[PDB]
C-alpha cells in the first residue's frame, strides 16, 4: 500500500507500506488541529479522531 505521510498542512508526501490501510489521525492543540497521516489503522486515545481507508493515497483530506 502507498499512503500519505505529511503532517497537517505541510506539502504532501507519500510512502510505501506493508499494511493494507492508510490513516488520517487528528486532534487539537493550542492553535488549531494537528493531523498525522500514515499507514495501518491505529487505535487512538480519547480526544483523538481517526479515519482509515484501504486504497492507495486515500488519506489526504
Amino acid at each position: 500500500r502507498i499512503c500519505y505521510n505529511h503532517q497537517s498542512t505541510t506539502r504532501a508526501t507519500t510512502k510505501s507500506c506493508e499494511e493494507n490501510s492508510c490513516y488520517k489521525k487528528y486532534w487539537r492543540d493550542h492553535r488549531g488541529t494537528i493531523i498525522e497521516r500514515g499507514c495501518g489503522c491505529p487505535k487512538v486515545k480519547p480526544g483523538v479522531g481517526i479515519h482509515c481507508c484501504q486504497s492507495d493515497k486515500c488519506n489526504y483530506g
Binding site: 491505529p42 487505535k43 487512538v44 486515545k45
Partner: protein, 208 residues
C-alpha cells in the same frame, strides 16, 4: 503489552543519569504523546516529575526532563543530587488495551558522596516481653552513608531496608526473635553491622 525499565541505576553526585522505559508503538510510541515519570521515596506516595507530552510538573527541578525516541522513553536527571535517590516509575497509555501501563520501577542510588560510619544501638528484651514468654532484641542502626549495609546476628557469640532519615543519612532496624527460653539460656547475643569495609559489633547478653 508491557513496558520495562532496568531494576537499578547508580550515579555519582553531579553526574547525568538516564532511566529508560522500553514500550511499544501502542503506548510509549503512541501519538499524541503521553509519558509519565513518577518519583517515589520508599514509604510515600509517588510524585509526578514528567507528564503528558514530556512536560515537567510544577515545582519540579529543571534537572529532570523526559524524551521519547521510537518506542523508548527516557528520564534524564542532569546533575543528580542526594535527594534524587528513589524509585522511578514510567507510565504510558496503551490504545490497544485502553489502559495505563506502568514499568517495574528503577531504583536510583547515589555514589561517591562522603561516607558516614553507622551508629549502632542494641536494646535487649524488656522485662515485660520476657514476662510474656518471648525475646526480641532490637538493633537500630542510624546515620550511615551510603545506604547499603549488611546486618549479621549472632547468639552465644528480620531486618528492614534502609530508609532516609530527616538529616539525609540512612537508618535500618533489625529484630532477633527467640522464645524467652532461647535467650535467657544464651550467653551473649550480638548485632554486627558491615558498611563500607568497616564492621561494628555491639553485644547484649542475658541480664541478671
Amino acid at each position: 503489552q508491557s513496558v520495562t525499565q532496568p531494576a537499578s541505576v547508580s550515579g555519582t553526585l553531579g553526574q547525568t543519569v538516564t532511566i529508560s522505559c522500553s514500550g511499544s508503538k501502542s503506548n510509549i510510541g503512541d501519538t499524541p504523546t503521553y509519558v509519565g515519570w513518577f518519583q517515589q521515596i520508599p514509604g510515600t506516595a509517588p510524585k509526578t516529575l514528567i507528564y503528558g507530552d514530556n512536560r515537567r510538573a510544577s515545582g519540579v527541578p529543571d534537572r529532570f526532563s523526559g524524551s521519547v525516541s521510537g518506542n523508548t522513553a527516557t528520564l534524564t536527571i542532569s546533575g543528580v543530587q542526594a535527594e534524587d535517590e528513589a524509585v522511578y516509575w514510567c507510565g504510558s497509555w496503551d490504545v490497544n488495551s485502553d489502559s495505563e501501563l506502568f514499568g517495574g520501577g528503577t531504583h536510583l542510588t547515589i555514589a561517591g558522596g562522603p561516607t558516614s560510619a553507622p551508629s549502632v544501638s542494641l536494646f535487649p528484651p524488656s522485662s515485660e516481653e520476657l514476662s510474656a514468654n518471648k525475646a526480641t532484641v532490637v538493633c537500630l542502626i542510624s546515620d550511615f552513608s551510603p545506604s547499603g549495609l549488611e546486618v549479621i546476628w549472632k547468639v552465644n557469640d528480620q531486618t528492614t531496608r534502609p530508609s532516609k532519615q530527616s538529616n539525609g543519612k540512612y537508618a535500618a532496624s533489625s529484630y532477633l526473635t527467640r522464645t524467652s527460653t532461647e535467650w535467657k539460656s544464651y550467653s551473649s547475643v550480638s548485632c554486627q553491622v558491615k558498611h563500607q569495609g568497616k564492621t561494628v559489633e555491639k553485644k547484649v547478653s542475658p541480664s541478671e
